[PDB]
Antibody, heavy 211, light 216 residues
Framework: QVQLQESGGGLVQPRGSLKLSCAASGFTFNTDAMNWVRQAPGKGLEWVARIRSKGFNFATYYADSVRDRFTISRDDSQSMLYLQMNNLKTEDTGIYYC???????????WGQGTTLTVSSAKTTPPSVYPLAPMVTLGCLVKGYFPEPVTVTWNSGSLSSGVHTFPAVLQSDLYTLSSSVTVPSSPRPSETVTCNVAHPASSTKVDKKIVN | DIQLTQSPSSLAVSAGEKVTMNCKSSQNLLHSITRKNYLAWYRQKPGQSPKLLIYWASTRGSGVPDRFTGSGSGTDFTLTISSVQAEDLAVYYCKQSYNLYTFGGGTKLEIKRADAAPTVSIFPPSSEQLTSGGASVVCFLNNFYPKDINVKWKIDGSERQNGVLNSWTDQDSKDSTYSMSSTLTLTKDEYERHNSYTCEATHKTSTSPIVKSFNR
């Protein structure tokens, strides 16, 4: 199956530079044209760049807003696509998707995406507080930066009943919450845990909602 | 720079119904030689990557079902989704391939369902937080419809309108309901100065506000 994995996103300061990379699988990378499309926070999609195959001498194209600052490239030998970003501006904040898009057709496959934040703020670890009272337990995740964070209940065992609300940017710090409605029996009888991960500060906390 | 504009910006239809959104181009996309209209349609489910639905104005992508129909030529195109399910909630973008690429603003598709009263849950600050010199009272208003709801924070009786951070979730692809989180964050000391805290919710699905309290 086609697989597109983008890595390298992150917190960068204005005027800095970052380099995203993409790993392609399940198709002949050496023949297709590859693109980069981004989605700004609270916005639609915006095509960023494109690089054609060797058959068309690696012809590259860039959007007006990114031209001369970015550099798309590829390594057909490793099935890797890259995006060198220089002179980063805060406008470039958003999710970058690696997208296969053959010439003349349309954009076939998109990856999961990698978040990129451009700001002079500092990485701040999140503080997870267990919210303890069908019973609704919860978990407060506040004061982190930058986005995003990853919340789950019982490492994944608990998917239905969960509600993770979008983070809100209060006073330069994000705050997010997650709730889980389980039967009145499995708690306090059975253990319910709030798994939280914050890549930017290599954090992982497991807060057991006890009461 | 061809700029496409979509409409409406939002739509709300019921399951089983047919819907039609539009995409207007500032420049003609029909290539005179190949006779193809270089316009595509994609959609993005809440928290998922965009998926291709149609290209060349009406050709479905592999795997895309016949419920999806693209139409139009020149500068006027339309997408018609038949048998809208609870699973079609997303934003639909049209994109042009006539000269480089350009997506439109997108159209959001909500699903009109039956009214649903929220399930309120108030939570006092945690010991851990208190020991940190702060106090956040959180309130969860889950699974309701429509999205329009009013939540008030009342401390002892007076209404608190400062220090409230609210946040809604996208409409659930499962039950088509919304959920909301309201958080009041006072200092560990100000929290000490009061007893009963209340989360009050007013939503069309009830005559009187739904109140949830806890005295400190």
């Amino acid at each position: 199956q086609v697989q597109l994995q983008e890595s390298g996103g992150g917190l960068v300061q204005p005027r800095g530079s970052l380099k995203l990379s993409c790993a392609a699988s399940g198709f002949t990378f050496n023949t297709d044209a590859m693109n980069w499309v981004r989605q700004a926070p609270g916005k639609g999609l915006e095509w960023v760049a494109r690089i054609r195959s060797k058959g068309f001498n690696f012809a590259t194209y860039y959007a007006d807003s990114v031209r001369d600052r970015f550099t798309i490239s590829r390594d057909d030998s490793q099935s890797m696509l890259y995006l060198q970003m220089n002179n980063l501006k805060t406008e470039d904040t958003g999710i970058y998707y690696c997208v296969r898009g053959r010439d003349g057709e349309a954009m076939d496959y998109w990856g999961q995406g990698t978040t990129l934040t451009v700001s002079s703020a500092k990485t701040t670890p999140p503080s997870v507080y267990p919210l303890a009272p069908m019973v609704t337990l919860g978990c407060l995740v506040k004061g982190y930066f930058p986005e995003p964070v990853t919340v789950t209940w019982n490492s994944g065992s608990l998917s239905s009943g969960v509600h993770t609300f979008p983070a809100v940017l209060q006073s330069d710090l994000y705050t997010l919450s997650s709730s889980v409605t389980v039967p009145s029996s499995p708690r306090p009888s059975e253990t319910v845990t709030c798994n939280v991960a914050h890549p930017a500060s290599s954090t992982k906390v497991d807060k057991k909602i006890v009461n | 720079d061809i700029q496409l504009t979509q409409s409406p910006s939002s739509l709300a239809v019921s399951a089983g119904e047919k819907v039609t959104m539009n995409c207007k181009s500032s420049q003609n996309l029909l290539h005179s030689i190949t006779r193809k209209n270089y316009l595509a349609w994609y959609r993005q489910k809440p928290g998922q990557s965009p998926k291709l639905l149609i290209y060349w104005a009406s050709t479905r992508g592999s795997g895309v079902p016949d419920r999806f129909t693209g139409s139009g030529s020149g500068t006027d195109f339309t997408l018609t989704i038949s048998s809208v399910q609870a699973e079609d909630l997303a934003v639909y973008y049209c994109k042009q391939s006539y000269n480089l690429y350009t997506f439109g603003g997108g159209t959001k598709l909500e699903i009109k369902r039956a009214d649903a009263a929220p399930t309120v849950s108030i939570f006092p600050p945690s010991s851990e937080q208190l020991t940190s010199g702060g106090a956040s009272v959180v309130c969860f208003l889950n699974n309701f419809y429509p999205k329009d709801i009013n939540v008030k924070w009342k401390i002892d009786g007076s209404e608190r309108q400062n220090g409230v951070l609210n946040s809604w979730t996208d409409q659930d692809s499962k039950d088509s309901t919304y959920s909301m989180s309201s958080t009041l964050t006072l200092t560990k000391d100000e929290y000490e100065r009061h007893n009963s805290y209340t989360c009050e919710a007013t939503h069309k699905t009830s005559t009187s506000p739904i109140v949830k309290s806890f005295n400190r």
